[PDB]
Amino acid sequence: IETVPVKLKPGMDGPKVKQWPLTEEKIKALVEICTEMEKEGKISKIGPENPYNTPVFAIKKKDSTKWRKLVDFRELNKRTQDFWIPHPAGLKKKKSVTVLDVGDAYFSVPLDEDFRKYTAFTIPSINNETPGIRYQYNVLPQGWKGSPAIFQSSMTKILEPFKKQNPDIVIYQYMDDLYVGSDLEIGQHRTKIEELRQHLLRWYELHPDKWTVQPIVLPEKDSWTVNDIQKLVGKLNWASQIYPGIKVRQLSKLLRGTKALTEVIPLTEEAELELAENREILKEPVHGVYYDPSKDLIAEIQKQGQGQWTYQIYQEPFKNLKTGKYARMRGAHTNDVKQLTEAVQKITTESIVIWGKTPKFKLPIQKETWETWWTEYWQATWIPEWEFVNTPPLVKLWYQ
Amino acid sequence: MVPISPIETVPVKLKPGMDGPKVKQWPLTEEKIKALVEICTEMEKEGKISKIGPENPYNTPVFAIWRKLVDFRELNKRTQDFWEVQLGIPHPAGLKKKKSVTVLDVGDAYFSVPLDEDFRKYTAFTIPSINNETPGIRYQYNVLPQGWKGSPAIFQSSMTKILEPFAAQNPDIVIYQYMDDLYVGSDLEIGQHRTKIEELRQHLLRWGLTTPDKKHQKEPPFLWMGYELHPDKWTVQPIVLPEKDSWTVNDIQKLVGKLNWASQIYPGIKVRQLSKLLRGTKALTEVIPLTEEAELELAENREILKEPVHGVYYDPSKDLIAEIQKQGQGQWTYQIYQEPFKNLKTGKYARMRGAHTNDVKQLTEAVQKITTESIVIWGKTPKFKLPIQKETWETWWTEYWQATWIPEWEFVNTPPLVKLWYQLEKEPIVGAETFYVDGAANRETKLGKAGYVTNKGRQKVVPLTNTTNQKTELQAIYLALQDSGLEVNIVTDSQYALGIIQAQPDKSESELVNQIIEQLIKKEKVYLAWVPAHKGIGGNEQVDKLV
Ligand SMILES: C=CC(=O)N(C)c1cc(Oc2ccccc2OCCn2ccc(=O)[nH]c2=O)c(C)c2cc(C#N)ccc12
């Protein structure tokens, strides 16, 4: 009911990002949505004196047949002043966590006058026929980093009774999402979630406990071929960059000679001992692996085939903070890009739960393909940063 | 007098921290001064400008050619940024046929859009007096000046706001705005069409804007931005390939401009060689000889540009189809159409700059380009006809290390067909010879050695002059491919060579890589295994090639 002064970082102008082309159905959907929001005063039309722009597109969330308006506030977010809560380290330790969309609440708080011109967006026209319908926000917009910061006081006032009632439930807020962690039963968790949503009304099952870090495992065989031993030495030599005392000379001693790849080689006793010591070393965690809030999180994804994908979140090379294997099959058996996009969304969600920020992705995809199709399968309210790797990494099969 | 509705002004500011323009007035002849006094007197009598006292410290130079021309370049440098009047120009293939299309001149409305009151003082200009014996006449603009930075955007937004209710209450018509001309199309009867045109003239007159009752000089076919727009079709303005015995750099830039421009409707246009002659020249006047390939390409261009070809307009009720053909040397051509033999438009795609490539990657890129272009022009992705078997694409994307995807498509049997030329095995081959390869080079003398030893005792080491480590590793693999049977296992330590071959190219800049490709094509089964170097892995003989 009272606007809080918001400004930009010193020396930075407002965002001026090109609106990318949209299909006719998404354009019409945005026309209906923005017409309704204009009737509700949440947005207002602007004139040509507003040179700033932020991209916009339309998606469809899970279990819904209604379109939703998605704004790519990445540039405005990085250009918006830094607002100033320590991240809950217990949210990732909880048994279950539920994600709620509390974006509508932001629309009840007006936006600072002089800042509104920085939220300008354009509904594009097909074939550049019309100049495009230009809008700016009058309330807190969903996707902007200032919306949760400004609404934080009101959110604390709304969640104060529920927090005082259940001190065993951890509540976190990131962007337009509310993460509610507990240790109850799935039925009790769903009834409690309905309790919280009806509590918020009058004013996504996720289980981190079924998630752990993945160790480097070595094969257990009774007979080893030359190729088997070569791959084992390769993987151990790769792991020696992460683990110090990895030793491979007794296993490479077996490869002496020019033998056929499919020839079985019996392991000497020194080779068995070396391999056992290497197993023991790999069973231990990595030495000196810490998280630094001042550094960026990097996520790497490898396509393993048959709907399987591997990923690693780290900050320094060979110092993995998280590793995982997303192999879920959800209506994307014939589309690599949809699978990759869902994987990026899940990894970003896990990163939000663990560290409270999104990582920078290294995607195994050509820039043009990804930039052409990723919005067709996006369903989250946030968007991470990403880059593209064009050289096939050798370590792929070492995470398989 | 009928009350005229006022046009709301757009608040305009200068760039932050900057001040208005202050430029010295150009000295003018007596006749030019008289002409500018007459013109400015008439404009003042019409309300476009107003006289100002000496308190205004700003000034913009004025000229006459009469006709008054004001040089606002400094004020343009000092004026704020505006939203772009147009993000791009439409494409004729996106237009939808109309029974009637009328053109209305709203030029009289250009100088009838008021300027922001607080900004008018920055448009001040001075007419010099005769012999400069009196103070020059001081004027300022009250409407959007011609040549000012913000005039097109403010004019288009004002006209759009004016036309919004008329276009809303008349959905059965279509109104487009371009500069000082409106274009109104409809499928109504011609009488109803002229009626609604009169309604538009009245609605525009409710803001005091006058459309000429005179018949419009613009009539079909409309010539616009290198385009011919006819009542039922469109094409490019005629393209003439000149007959030149000697071709300079500017002649080839004009030829590749006419060919690139003509390629959007004329199918089969190629520009590889003619643009290749421009590689790293940076000299506009240099004459460059014409290669034989450029001569054959130019001849095929003259054969394609023999007789005129037209494109049809878009019909949203029919499906959108895009068909791709391979042309060689990284050249691809495509036609977008809805009915056979009747193209909406055509185009081409050239492969990107790369050391290695294959046809499937290029086809994928071309598909993405056509998809983006189609979403721009028609707002939907077309259904594709591609020269590639379904099983080929399935093998590729299922085995490719990168994520890839093309939208709905079907196979069309138009050679040359994109195919996978070789496929590496996933497991070692039983019964096949195992070639342990290696290569090495001296960094100073550039002397190296490449070779292999096999499980059957076969061996070879070849010495090489003027080579590198990477070159000797590739050469080693090539030797193993040369001297092996149809099925072969190959063991290397070169992360470089494995990185090249796992990218699956079918063509390369390096002749060595191309030779390796040609050897792989002849094989039945190839398994390529990698090992770490200098780890004492027997068979992998680093010392045999470092002698
Ligand atoms: C703002 C306009 C614009 O951007 N562009 C591309 C334009 C569209 C445009 O045509 C239509 C204007 C109204 C509705 C539909 C239009 O097209 C339908 C197809 N079409 C085309 C021609 C025809 O005779 N019959 C027909 O059915 C015309 C006639 C233009 C003419 C000039 C000139 N000088 C310049 C631009 C033009």
PDB file of C-alpha atoms in Angstrom, chain A residues 219-347:
ATOM      1  CA  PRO A 219      33.647 -52.912 -12.118  1.00  0.00           C
ATOM      2  CA  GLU A 220      33.682 -56.247 -10.299  1.00  0.00           C
ATOM      3  CA  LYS A 221      34.584 -59.009 -12.749  1.00  0.00           C
ATOM      4  CA  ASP A 222      35.918 -62.545 -12.613  1.00  0.00           C
ATOM      5  CA  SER A 223      37.578 -62.245 -16.038  1.00  0.00           C
ATOM      6  CA  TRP A 224      39.061 -59.056 -17.498  1.00  0.00           C
ATOM      7  CA  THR A 225      39.783 -58.455 -21.172  1.00  0.00           C
ATOM      8  CA  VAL A 226      42.477 -56.112 -22.455  1.00  0.00           C
ATOM      9  CA  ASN A 227      39.755 -53.588 -23.281  1.00  0.00           C
ATOM     10  CA  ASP A 228      38.247 -53.910 -19.787  1.00  0.00           C
ATOM     11  CA  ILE A 229      41.628 -53.204 -18.190  1.00  0.00           C
ATOM     12  CA  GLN A 230      42.285 -50.294 -20.560  1.00  0.00           C
ATOM     13  CA  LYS A 231      38.983 -48.645 -19.655  1.00  0.00           C
ATOM     14  CA  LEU A 232      39.665 -49.313 -15.968  1.00  0.00           C
ATOM     15  CA  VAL A 233      43.095 -47.670 -16.175  1.00  0.00           C
ATOM     16  CA  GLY A 234      41.556 -44.743 -18.048  1.00  0.00           C
ATOM     17  CA  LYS A 235      38.861 -44.227 -15.418  1.00  0.00           C
ATOM     18  CA  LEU A 236      41.340 -44.595 -12.545  1.00  0.00           C
ATOM     19  CA  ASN A 237      43.733 -42.138 -14.200  1.00  0.00           C
ATOM     20  CA  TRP A 238      40.835 -39.702 -14.514  1.00  0.00           C
ATOM     21  CA  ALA A 239      39.875 -40.250 -10.867  1.00  0.00           C
ATOM     22  CA  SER A 240      43.472 -39.590  -9.762  1.00  0.00           C
ATOM     23  CA  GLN A 241      42.824 -35.905 -10.502  1.00  0.00           C
ATOM     24  CA  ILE A 242      40.148 -35.998  -7.784  1.00  0.00           C
ATOM     25  CA  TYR A 243      41.644 -38.591  -5.410  1.00  0.00           C
ATOM     26  CA  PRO A 244      45.344 -38.321  -4.550  1.00  0.00           C
ATOM     27  CA  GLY A 245      46.627 -41.824  -3.867  1.00  0.00           C
ATOM     28  CA  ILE A 246      45.158 -43.507  -6.949  1.00  0.00           C
ATOM     29  CA  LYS A 247      47.782 -45.925  -8.280  1.00  0.00           C
ATOM     30  CA  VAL A 248      47.608 -47.634 -11.684  1.00  0.00           C
ATOM     31  CA  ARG A 249      51.096 -49.006 -12.394  1.00  0.00           C
ATOM     32  CA  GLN A 250      50.318 -52.583 -11.329  1.00  0.00           C
ATOM     33  CA  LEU A 251      47.231 -52.674 -13.565  1.00  0.00           C
ATOM     34  CA  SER A 252      49.085 -51.086 -16.483  1.00  0.00           C
ATOM     35  CA  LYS A 253      51.772 -53.730 -15.911  1.00  0.00           C
ATOM     36  CA  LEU A 254      49.260 -56.297 -17.189  1.00  0.00           C
ATOM     37  CA  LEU A 255      48.787 -54.391 -20.455  1.00  0.00           C
ATOM     38  CA  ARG A 256      52.451 -55.015 -21.336  1.00  0.00           C
ATOM     39  CA  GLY A 257      52.583 -56.515 -24.806  1.00  0.00           C
ATOM     40  CA  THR A 258      50.491 -56.045 -27.939  1.00  0.00           C
ATOM     41  CA  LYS A 259      47.524 -58.265 -27.154  1.00  0.00           C
ATOM     42  CA  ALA A 260      44.149 -58.389 -28.867  1.00  0.00           C
ATOM     43  CA  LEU A 261      41.515 -56.187 -27.239  1.00  0.00           C
ATOM     44  CA  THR A 262      39.110 -59.066 -26.545  1.00  0.00           C
ATOM     45  CA  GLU A 263      41.783 -61.291 -24.984  1.00  0.00           C
ATOM     46  CA  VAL A 264      41.175 -62.298 -21.377  1.00  0.00           C
ATOM     47  CA  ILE A 265      44.012 -61.380 -19.008  1.00  0.00           C
ATOM     48  CA  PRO A 266      44.196 -62.868 -15.493  1.00  0.00           C
ATOM     49  CA  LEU A 267      44.924 -60.320 -12.784  1.00  0.00           C
ATOM     50  CA  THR A 268      48.132 -60.719 -10.814  1.00  0.00           C
ATOM     51  CA  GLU A 269      47.970 -60.449  -7.032  1.00  0.00           C
ATOM     52  CA  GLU A 270      49.627 -57.016  -7.071  1.00  0.00           C
ATOM     53  CA  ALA A 271      46.943 -55.879  -9.526  1.00  0.00           C
ATOM     54  CA  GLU A 272      44.154 -57.133  -7.253  1.00  0.00           C
ATOM     55  CA  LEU A 273      45.733 -55.366  -4.273  1.00  0.00           C
ATOM     56  CA  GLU A 274      46.134 -52.127  -6.236  1.00  0.00           C
ATOM     57  CA  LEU A 275      42.518 -52.299  -7.433  1.00  0.00           C
ATOM     58  CA  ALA A 276      41.330 -52.961  -3.874  1.00  0.00           C
ATOM     59  CA  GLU A 277      43.291 -50.006  -2.482  1.00  0.00           C
ATOM     60  CA  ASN A 278      41.759 -47.887  -5.246  1.00  0.00           C
ATOM     61  CA  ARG A 279      38.263 -49.032  -4.245  1.00  0.00           C
ATOM     62  CA  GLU A 280      38.999 -48.110  -0.625  1.00  0.00           C
ATOM     63  CA  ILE A 281      40.249 -44.685  -1.719  1.00  0.00           C
ATOM     64  CA  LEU A 282      37.167 -44.082  -3.872  1.00  0.00           C
ATOM     65  CA  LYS A 283      34.866 -44.998  -0.966  1.00  0.00           C
ATOM     66  CA  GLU A 284      36.071 -41.901   0.936  1.00  0.00           C
ATOM     67  CA  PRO A 285      34.830 -38.354   0.260  1.00  0.00           C
ATOM     68  CA  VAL A 286      36.875 -35.814  -1.661  1.00  0.00           C
ATOM     69  CA  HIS A 287      39.470 -33.886   0.339  1.00  0.00           C
ATOM     70  CA  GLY A 288      38.789 -30.209   1.012  1.00  0.00           C
ATOM     71  CA  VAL A 289      35.450 -29.674  -0.742  1.00  0.00           C
ATOM     72  CA  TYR A 290      33.671 -26.542   0.468  1.00  0.00           C
ATOM     73  CA  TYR A 291      31.058 -24.125  -0.846  1.00  0.00           C
ATOM     74  CA  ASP A 292      31.873 -20.445  -1.402  1.00  0.00           C
ATOM     75  CA  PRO A 293      28.850 -18.093  -1.589  1.00  0.00           C
ATOM     76  CA  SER A 294      30.957 -15.511  -3.458  1.00  0.00           C
ATOM     77  CA  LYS A 295      31.598 -17.843  -6.422  1.00  0.00           C
ATOM     78  CA  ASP A 296      29.334 -19.110  -9.183  1.00  0.00           C
ATOM     79  CA  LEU A 297      27.878 -22.607  -9.305  1.00  0.00           C
ATOM     80  CA  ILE A 298      28.645 -24.556 -12.490  1.00  0.00           C
ATOM     81  CA  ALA A 299      26.460 -27.445 -13.666  1.00  0.00           C
ATOM     82  CA  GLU A 300      27.601 -29.858 -16.383  1.00  0.00           C
ATOM     83  CA  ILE A 301      25.184 -32.254 -18.100  1.00  0.00           C
ATOM     84  CA  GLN A 302      26.126 -35.264 -20.232  1.00  0.00           C
ATOM     85  CA  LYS A 303      23.700 -37.169 -22.453  1.00  0.00           C
ATOM     86  CA  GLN A 304      24.101 -40.885 -21.728  1.00  0.00           C
ATOM     87  CA  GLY A 305      21.462 -42.216 -24.135  1.00  0.00           C
ATOM     88  CA  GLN A 306      18.193 -44.075 -23.569  1.00  0.00           C
ATOM     89  CA  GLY A 307      16.754 -41.108 -21.682  1.00  0.00           C
ATOM     90  CA  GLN A 308      19.624 -41.113 -19.170  1.00  0.00           C
ATOM     91  CA  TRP A 309      21.458 -37.915 -18.237  1.00  0.00           C
ATOM     92  CA  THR A 310      24.299 -37.262 -15.801  1.00  0.00           C
ATOM     93  CA  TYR A 311      25.140 -33.979 -14.112  1.00  0.00           C
ATOM     94  CA  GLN A 312      27.705 -32.458 -11.762  1.00  0.00           C
ATOM     95  CA  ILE A 313      27.501 -29.213  -9.778  1.00  0.00           C
ATOM     96  CA  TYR A 314      30.878 -27.791  -8.759  1.00  0.00           C
ATOM     97  CA  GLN A 315      32.714 -24.502  -8.290  1.00  0.00           C
ATOM     98  CA  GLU A 316      36.324 -25.607  -8.855  1.00  0.00           C
ATOM     99  CA  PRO A 317      37.370 -28.364 -11.285  1.00  0.00           C
ATOM    100  CA  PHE A 318      37.367 -31.826  -9.657  1.00  0.00           C
ATOM    101  CA  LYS A 319      35.704 -30.404  -6.508  1.00  0.00           C
ATOM    102  CA  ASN A 320      32.129 -31.572  -7.049  1.00  0.00           C
ATOM    103  CA  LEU A 321      29.538 -30.261  -4.608  1.00  0.00           C
ATOM    104  CA  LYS A 322      26.769 -32.436  -6.086  1.00  0.00           C
ATOM    105  CA  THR A 323      26.464 -35.239  -8.638  1.00  0.00           C
ATOM    106  CA  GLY A 324      23.345 -36.844 -10.017  1.00  0.00           C
ATOM    107  CA  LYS A 325      21.731 -38.980 -12.693  1.00  0.00           C
ATOM    108  CA  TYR A 326      18.367 -37.799 -14.062  1.00  0.00           C
ATOM    109  CA  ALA A 327      16.786 -40.686 -15.994  1.00  0.00           C
ATOM    110  CA  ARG A 328      13.085 -39.848 -15.595  1.00  0.00           C
ATOM    111  CA  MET A 329      10.764 -40.539 -18.545  1.00  0.00           C
ATOM    112  CA  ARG A 330       7.823 -38.082 -18.719  1.00  0.00           C
ATOM    113  CA  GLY A 331       6.434 -37.709 -22.239  1.00  0.00           C
ATOM    114  CA  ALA A 332       9.782 -36.935 -23.885  1.00  0.00           C
ATOM    115  CA  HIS A 333      10.933 -40.345 -25.153  1.00  0.00           C
ATOM    116  CA  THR A 334      11.491 -38.989 -28.686  1.00  0.00           C
ATOM    117  CA  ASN A 335      12.709 -35.430 -27.934  1.00  0.00           C
ATOM    118  CA  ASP A 336      16.254 -34.816 -26.689  1.00  0.00           C
ATOM    119  CA  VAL A 337      15.674 -31.085 -26.184  1.00  0.00           C
ATOM    120  CA  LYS A 338      12.619 -31.574 -23.965  1.00  0.00           C
ATOM    121  CA  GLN A 339      14.568 -34.055 -21.829  1.00  0.00           C
ATOM    122  CA  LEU A 340      17.506 -31.654 -21.542  1.00  0.00           C
ATOM    123  CA  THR A 341      15.200 -28.765 -20.618  1.00  0.00           C
ATOM    124  CA  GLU A 342      13.451 -30.783 -17.901  1.00  0.00           C
ATOM    125  CA  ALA A 343      16.863 -31.877 -16.611  1.00  0.00           C
ATOM    126  CA  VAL A 344      18.017 -28.251 -16.429  1.00  0.00           C
ATOM    127  CA  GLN A 345      14.854 -27.360 -14.516  1.00  0.00           C
ATOM    128  CA  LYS A 346      15.293 -30.191 -11.991  1.00  0.00           C
ATOM    129  CA  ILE A 347      18.994 -29.444 -11.467  1.00  0.00           C
TER     130      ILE A 347
END
